[PDB]
Amino acid sequence: DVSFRLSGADPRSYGMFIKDLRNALPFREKVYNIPLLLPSVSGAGRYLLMHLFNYDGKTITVAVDVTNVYIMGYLADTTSYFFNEPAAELASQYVFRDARRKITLPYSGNYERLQIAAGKPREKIPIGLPALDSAISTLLHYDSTAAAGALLVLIQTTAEAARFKYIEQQIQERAYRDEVPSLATISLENSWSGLSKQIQLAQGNNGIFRTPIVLVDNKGNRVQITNVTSKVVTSNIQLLLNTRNI
Numbered sequence: 001d002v003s004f005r006l007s008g009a010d011p012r013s014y015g016m017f018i019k020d021l022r023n024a025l026p027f028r029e030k031v032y033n034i035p036l037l038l039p040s041v042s043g044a045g046r047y048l049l050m051h052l053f054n055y056d057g058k059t060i061t062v063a064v065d066v067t068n069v070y071i072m073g074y075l076a077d078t079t080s081y082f083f084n085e086p087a088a089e090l091a092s093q094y095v096f097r098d099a100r101r102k103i104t105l106p107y108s109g110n111y112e113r114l115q116i117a118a119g120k121p122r123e124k125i126p127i128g129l130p131a132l133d134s135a136i137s138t139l140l141h142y143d144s145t146a147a148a149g150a151l152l153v154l155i156q157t158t159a160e161a162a163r164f165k166y167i168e169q170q171i172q173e174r175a176y177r178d179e180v181p182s183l184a185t186i187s188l189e190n191s192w193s194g195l196s197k198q199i200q201l202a203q204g205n206n207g208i209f210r211t212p213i214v215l216v217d218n219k220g221n222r223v224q225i226t227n228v229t230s231k232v233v234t235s236n237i238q239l240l241l242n243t244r245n246i
């Protein structure tokens with residue numbers, strides 16, 4: 001398992017937690033020195049548990065699918081909560097079985113459905129460590145509309161930060177003051193599968209993408225990624241979704 005405490009948290013401790021989250025995910029090979037997530041994992045070993053503590057020391061445990069870094073659900077005291085989708089249904093056969101009751105959230109765990117439930121797009125929701133503290137606290141007591149926004153914060157400050165060093169850095173910059181994500185952050189989140197695929201297809205094509213990927217950079221400009229010498233590939237992306245799952 002991995003753990004992170006908001007009490008005493010700073011950019012250093014958050015960065016270390018994200019390193020630990022990345023390194024908790026199994027892989028058997030690297031592609032251009034980036035861990036390639038496994039095509040499949042059978043049984044309980046498919047799920048990583050992340051123990052998150054809010055500033056007051058109250059805790060939730062979050063179950064993450066190690067093949068894609070997707071959050072399946074979480075445990076708050078004696079109640080488990082799972083997204084309304086087959087992958088989370090499966091997860092609930094393996095994790096948090098000791099919970100006294102299970103609530104299936106009234107949405108699946110993708111951005112489209114979460115944004116509808118929250119009533120707002122990612123672009124308008126501040127993120128940062130204070131927002132993560134708030135998100136943990138919200139998830140402690142069931143409220144599905146509030147939970148949708150909290151889960152948008154949680155996903156971006158854990159899974160997306162693990163996937164992209166740039167997003168990790170954005171959250172570090174928001175350690176003590178929340179701010180909506182940059183355009184670049186949104187573009188990277190929206191392109192993780194596409195980038196993962198092209199980096200894998202570039203092996204066998206001399207590091208050249210079969211199909212270029214368009215992103216927004218940290219200055220807000222459109223850029224086209226065409227090959228693995230791009231900083232997006234050499235320093236930014238940290239985990240690759242297996243093409244078997246694309």
Ligand SMILES: *[C@@H]1O[C@H](CO)[C@@H](O)[C@H](O)[C@H]1NC(C)=O
Binds near residue numbers: 226227230
């Ligand atoms: C490969 O990517 C690098 C880094 O972004 C870029 O400078 C170079 O022009 C690209 N090569 C092409 C497009 O042939």
Ligand SMILES: NC(=O)c1cccnc1
Binds near residue numbers: 070071072159
């Ligand atoms: N459910 C998730 O953890 C999730 C959702 C959207 C993108 N990445 C991860």
